[PDB]
Design an enzyme around this catalytic site. Structure first.
Site, PDB file in Angstrom:
ATOM      1  N   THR A 251      70.223   9.112  15.593  1.00 53.54           N
ATOM      2  CA  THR A 251      71.651   9.459  14.794  1.00 53.54           C
ATOM      3  C   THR A 251      71.644   8.746  13.385  1.00 53.54           C
ATOM      4  OG1 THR A 251      72.825   7.803  15.689  1.00 53.54           O
ATOM      5  CG2 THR A 251      72.447   9.654  17.039  1.00 53.54           C
ATOM      6  N   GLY A 252      70.447   8.218  12.842  1.00 54.85           N
ATOM      7  CA  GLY A 252      70.540   7.825  11.453  1.00 54.85           C
ATOM      8  C   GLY A 252      70.514   8.981  10.504  1.00 54.85           C
ATOM      9  N   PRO A 253      70.356   8.772   9.295  1.00 55.98           N
ATOM     10  CA  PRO A 253      70.391   9.737   8.213  1.00 55.98           C
ATOM     11  C   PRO A 253      69.360  10.845   8.270  1.00 55.98           C
ATOM     12  CG  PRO A 253      70.229   7.590   7.001  1.00 55.98           C
ATOM     13  CD  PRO A 253      70.871   7.417   8.495  1.00 55.98           C
ATOM     14  N   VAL A 254      68.060  10.490   8.849  1.00 55.29           N
ATOM     15  CA  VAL A 254      66.994  11.159   9.268  1.00 55.29           C
ATOM     16  C   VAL A 254      67.308  12.490   9.974  1.00 55.29           C
ATOM     17  CG1 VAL A 254      64.756  11.544  10.134  1.00 55.29           C
ATOM     18  CG2 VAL A 254      65.116   9.698   8.396  1.00 55.29           C
TER      19      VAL A 254
ATOM     20  N   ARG B 183      72.224   5.327  20.642  1.00 57.54           N
ATOM     21  CA  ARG B 183      72.451   4.290  21.555  1.00 57.54           C
ATOM     22  C   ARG B 183      73.333   3.208  21.332  1.00 57.54           C
ATOM     23  NH1 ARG B 183      67.983  -0.016  19.432  1.00 57.54           N
ATOM     24  NH2 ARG B 183      68.676   0.264  17.203  1.00 57.54           N
TER      25      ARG B 183
ATOM     26  N   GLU C  48      75.374  -1.057  16.804  1.00 58.51           N
ATOM     27  CA  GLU C  48      76.743  -0.961  16.250  1.00 58.51           C
ATOM     28  C   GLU C  48      76.536   0.012  15.285  1.00 58.51           C
ATOM     29  OE1 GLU C  48      79.475  -1.936  17.847  1.00 58.51           O
ATOM     30  OE2 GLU C  48      80.927  -1.590  16.619  1.00 58.51           O
ATOM     31  N   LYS C  49      75.387   0.196  14.806  1.00 59.85           N
ATOM     32  CA  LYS C  49      75.300   1.223  13.643  1.00 59.85           C
ATOM     33  C   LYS C  49      75.560   2.663  14.599  1.00 59.85           C
ATOM     34  CE  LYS C  49      71.179  -0.064  12.521  1.00 59.85           C
ATOM     35  NZ  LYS C  49      70.591   1.084  11.655  1.00 59.85           N
ATOM     36  N   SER C  50      74.460   3.014  15.557  1.00 61.10           N
ATOM     37  CA  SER C  50      74.825   4.025  16.641  1.00 61.10           C
ATOM     38  C   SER C  50      76.430   4.197  17.181  1.00 61.10           C
ATOM     39  CB  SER C  50      73.965   3.791  17.825  1.00 61.10           C
ATOM     40  OG  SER C  50      73.022   4.760  17.825  1.00 61.10           O
TER      41      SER C  50
ATOM     42  N   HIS D  58      52.055  -1.723   2.595  1.00 63.08           N
ATOM     43  CA  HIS D  58      53.225  -2.486   3.062  1.00 63.08           C
ATOM     44  C   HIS D  58      52.796  -3.848   3.834  1.00 63.08           C
ATOM     45  CE1 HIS D  58      56.404   0.221   1.890  1.00 63.08           C
ATOM     46  NE2 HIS D  58      57.051  -0.022   3.010  1.00 63.08           N
TER      47      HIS D  58
END
Lengths: 428, 428
Positions: free
Chosen positions: A8-11, A32, A37-39, A215
């Protein structure tokens, strides 16, 4: 005609708006709260407004924007039930396995296609081997990377996202040649005005990601691991030259060495090699014609080791600024290099997290290392990268015994991923 | 025990203070006012005060400071009369011959020692050959460079100068091995706490000047010539990477090529080669240990070409900032690179002048070319530098027909210097 969007992030949100405008799927999204706490602030923010929203910056990307609604937002993966034809994985590659294995047997048995947005090298083998148990003919599809750059402008309103930029070119590969789903994606890309190259396999797709090669040397060295885990007297920068950043001849050699280690692995899978310099220069960020010879760029892969290194070093120096930006009245250009390092940080329940760089690179390298053991290809640079990371983790533990730490500080992570890969390669 | 100091700028003043405090000579200095408004202002300022003054910025160099008078300041070279045992040439190498040639027969025949403070490669050959007519056993001495940095803080008081720094190490060679004069300069340098290596010949000392190798590639290229002769839209910088400055893989290759052309010449004279990289890093400005490997530095001259180029390139990237300066709270260091180019400019009588860079380099490289030619050593990179400087000069004439221009814009200059070099090598 049901689609399960994991993340449920910007992607996830940008991809869901694409499915909403341009497909016939009913869309379920899965977060999740149980972990994040983002979710949770997202669930809450969507619950309140009953809309997602994609905004754009450059009016060239109009076709990605939208306000939209989903059929269902699930709060946590364990809460998922029912049949889904298509699952879209829009989360970190290191959670693919752990996420899927929490779905129900019924859900799992229904899936016909899993679509990996940001896979690493080996992701598809992991996912096809897991999903095998439950559908004897699962299709897995890998993209090289997410299609662009999408962020949240207000942490307070995470259902509203801003897509700032879109990639020049993406790659994609499926476990099934010319499948109906590949063609739908191609026609979809065509409609989004995004160039998409279809390649012989998902593994091939997973290799066309410059972050895979870059990276690990950039973040898995003493200079960078210090800045991440311990901090610095004055700020330092990921893309600057020592002492302002880690970039150094040593660094560039470790990058060449990792890139060659990977090309030995690509030859074993009969996947064509990557011209890392051309890739960088023609697909990631250009340089001025004066900075690098076209001939050197073209023929990079057969040039002497030392010259390959010289070219990579020069590439990074040319990008210390944006040479294509407008210079100011003093002839200074936009400081494109000044990207700070994310440090380890306490989440809101005082638990210590290791940032994405290098958490995820640890997972990436760990998988490549693993594939290499399985194929009998030595990867001493990779081994060394993993050792330094592991050492910074143990040092963090010894020096911060009073703090709660996330499970990213543990060993031996990724056993399931590794067993799956082992089984996939025993089978072919 | 009379010494004639040719020059009245800050180099001349600092050296005359040395001779005033540390030698038995009576000192006369020679300017050229019938020719120079700077030289005229100095004459008038010394006429008014009857004192010169060297000040120092850093108390480490107390042994160089002082106020002093000389026996006689001549206004012009042609005015000089009488006998002088020792002549110190404290002016630009391109004027050595033209200046000496204006002295009287009697003065010339009296000279025993000519000492060259800022010679170029070949200056001693020119000066020895010239002086040979008049003194059969003339001793000629060449330093590598001037001992430091000395300027005029306030141009309306040019008899007052500030020495801001002293070199780590200088070299010196005489035509006369272990002469009394060499021994006295050595004893003199120990007293001044300046390290002076005595070498086998003036030519050997003349080659230990890093500017010989560096300045032609930095200033005699299209980017730099444009900035000097035409100007640019936004300021550009001598030491910066393209597009902010000329530095580029192409520039560094040109630098290696020229250096190697020089080294072939040095071999024809059995003069040891110069480890350009070690010189830049140990004798000029240091870099952090992490930037260059010690062995790379030591063994530079035997490294393959592409490695030599890489290390030179890195060397210049490392010095974009002063990595030994104190970084500020954002982690930014002092901007060591941001040296503007001096452009062509009109003197006080409206005559257009070419700045020292690259006027003087044109002379230097022209003598190098001539010497190559006489030895049958091919110097294609040097030929090209010269060609471009000449193209820029000619384009300027064509493009500014309404302007009065100095003689620096003419061809073929240096005829006399070249004829002397020819004659010297005829004889050896």
């Amino acid at each position: 005609s049901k689609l399960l969007m994991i993340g449920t992030g910007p992607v996830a949100i940008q991809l869901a708006n694409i499915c909403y405008l341009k497909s016939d799927y009913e869309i379920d999204m899965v977060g999740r709260a149980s972990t994040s706490e983002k979710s949770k602030r997202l669930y809450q923010a969507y619950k309140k407004e009953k809309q997602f929203e994609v905004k754009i910056q450059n009016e060239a990307h109009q076709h990605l924007e939208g306000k939209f609604e989903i059929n269902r937002l699930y709060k946590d993966v364990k809460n998922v039930k029912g049949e889904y034809e298509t699952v879209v994985m829009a989360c970190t590659a290191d959670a693919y396995y752990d996420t899927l294995q929490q779905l129900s047997l019924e859900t799992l048995q229904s899936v016909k296609h899993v679509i990996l947005i940001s896979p690493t090298f080996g992701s598809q083998m992991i996912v096809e081997q897991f999903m095998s148990k439950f559908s004897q003919d699962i299709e897995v599809i890998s993209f090289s990377t997410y299609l662009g750059d999408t962020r949240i402008v207000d942490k307070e309103a995470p259902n509203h996202v801003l897509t700032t930029g879109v990639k020049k070119k993406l790659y994609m590969g499926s476990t099934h040649s010319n499948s109906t789903m590949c063609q739908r994606i191609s026609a979809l890309a065509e409609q989004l005005k995004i160039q998409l190259e279809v390649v012989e396999s998902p593994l091939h797709a997973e290799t066309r990601n410059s972050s895979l090669y870059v990276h690990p040397p950039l973040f898995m060295n003493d200079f960078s691991l210090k800045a991440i885990f311990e901090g610095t007297d004055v700020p330092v920068y990921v893309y600057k030259l020592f002492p302002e950043g880690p970039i150094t001849m040593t660094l560039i050699r470790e990058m060449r060495l990792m890139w060659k280690e990977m090309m030995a692995i690509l030859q074993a899978f009969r996947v064509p090699s990557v011209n890392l310099l051309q890739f960088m220069v023609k697909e990631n960020y250009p340089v001025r014609p004066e900075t690098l010879d076209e001939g050197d760029i073209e023929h990079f892969e057969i040039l002497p080791d030392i010259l390959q290194e010289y070219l990579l070093y020069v590439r990074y120096t040319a990008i210390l600024i944006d040479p294509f930006s407008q210079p100011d009245e003093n002839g200074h250009y936009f400081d494109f290099s000044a990207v700070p390092f994310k440090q380890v940080y306490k989440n809101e329940q005082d638990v210590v997290q290791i940032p994405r760089m290098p958490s995820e690179d640890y997972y990436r390298t760990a998988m490549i290392q693993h594939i290499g053991k399985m194929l009998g290809i030595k990867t001493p640079m990779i081994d060394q990268f993993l050792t330094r990371y592991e050492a910074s983790c143990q040092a963090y533990k010894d020096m911060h015994q009073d703090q709660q730490l996330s499970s990213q500080f543990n060993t031996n992570l990724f056993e399931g991923d590794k067993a799956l890969v082992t089984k996939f390669l025993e089978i072919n």
